[PDB]
Design a protein around this ligand. Structure first.
Ligand SMILES: [Zn+2]
Lengths: 66, 114, 49, 89, 58
């Protein structure tokens, strides 16, 4: 139930709260109120490469031609 | 400057546009027109009103199997948490739909019976 | 080039890629003010331009 | 020209007469010093890495080769570091 | 109802503005070439000749 930077409940699919705005060791749902341990969800990592059209230049045109 | 626009027609050939706008904050906005003035609704108020949803089913219906697409996941982070931030209430279908009927009660000329 | 950037837990999610793109298009390496490009065309009517 | 008298002209230009002593190779290597170079024009790609659970952003910005952008725009390696240090951040 | 799919990686089959289902781009052209062969050949009792089958390839 951990996809990207957001987490869901395992029983109703509700979007859980941010695990650093809640008091420690417990993350509680708002519909099932299923309390999840804040300890080791994961390490919430998301990598985002830029759009590859974001930086047009004279030098980017030499990449796909050559 | 981005947006989408459908022109739905009824079976008696009567039209009604529904425009979704994209805000730079990351949330989207439903738009319509009942009389000659416009109205702006956030669409998760309308996604939770149409049927009995989960909140991963809003995620699983926009995202396909491309969970690794970090563009789509991050812009949908702002859309679902922005509805929880602005509306700590409105938690199931019969409660979102009473809020949506309470604001538009005087403009849809509803009865005192409804 | 790689630099860490830290925030607290009170702050909700920033995009931080549309931020970096819109700052990388504004930060100038070598700019003469109010001049964007300098072109050497073919010499029209004798004189060098 | 006539109707608006715009100081915010749509396409301003300026014509620069070359001296006859300097040659055409000393001119097109001179226009690179005048033409602007953006930090956008040197970057191949940027990869952020947001880790939380303290919001930690690892901004890794990947350039072109030093044998590639110091020939097109003649931007040196040490000048690129100060734009990141004193202009970008 | 049983699909779990979205995005341009698939192609969405719509009839008059509602989603009927989801199918791949490669099969979505085959079943757009098949439905034209079956509406012109008038043996199929469900496909009218007046139907518009707009397939947008990826
Ligand atoms: Zn729950």
């Amino acid at each position: 139930s951990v996809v990207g930077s957001l987490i869901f409940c395992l029983d109703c699919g509700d979007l859980l709260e941010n695990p650093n705005a809640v008091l420690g060791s417990n993350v509680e749902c708002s519909q099932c109120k299923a309390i999840y341990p804040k300890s080791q969800f994961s390490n919430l990592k998301v990598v985002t490469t830029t759009a590859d059209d974001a930086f047009p230049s004279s030098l980017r045109a030499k990449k796909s031609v050559v | 400057h981005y947006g989408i626009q459908i022109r739905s027609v009824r079976p008696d050939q009567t039209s009604q546009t529904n425009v979704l706008h994209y805000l730079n904050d990351g949330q989207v906005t439903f738009r319509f027109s009942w009389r000659k003035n416009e109205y702006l609704v956030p669409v998760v108020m309308i996604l939770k009103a149409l049927c009995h949803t989960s909140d991963r089913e809003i995620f699983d219906g926009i995202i396909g199997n491309d969970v690794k697409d970090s563009f789509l996941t991050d812009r949908l982070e702002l859309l679902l948490r922005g509805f929880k931030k602005r509306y700590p209430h409105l938690q199931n279908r019969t409660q979102v739909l009473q809020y949506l009927g309470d604001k538009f009660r005087v403009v849809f000329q509803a009865s005192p019976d409804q | 080039c790689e630099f860490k950037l830290e925030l607290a837990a009170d702050t909700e999610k920033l995009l931080m890629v549309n931020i970096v793109e819109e700052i990388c298009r504004k930060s100038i390496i070598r700019q003469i003010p109010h001049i964007d490009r300098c072109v050497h065309p073919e010499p029209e009517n004798g004189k060098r331009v | 020209i006539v109707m608006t008298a715009s100081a915010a002209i749509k396409t301003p230009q300026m014509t620069l007469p070359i001296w006859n002593d300097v040659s055409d190779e000393q001119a097109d290597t001179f226009c690179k010093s005048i033409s602007k170079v953006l930090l956008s024009e040197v970057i191949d790609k940027v990869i952020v890495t947001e880790t939380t659970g303290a919001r930690s952003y690892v901004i890794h910005m990947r350039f072109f080769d030093n044998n590639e952008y110091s020939e097109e725009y003649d931007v040196s390696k040490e000048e690129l570091q100060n734009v990141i240090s004193n202009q970008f951040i | 109802s049983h699909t779990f799919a979205a995005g341009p990686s698939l192609c969405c089959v719509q009839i008059d503005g509602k989603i009927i289902g989801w199918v791949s781009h490669e099969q979505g052209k085959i079943i757009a070439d098949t439905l034209r062969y079956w509406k012109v050949e008038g043996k199929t009792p469900g496909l009218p000749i007046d139907l518009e089958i707009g397939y947008v390839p990826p």
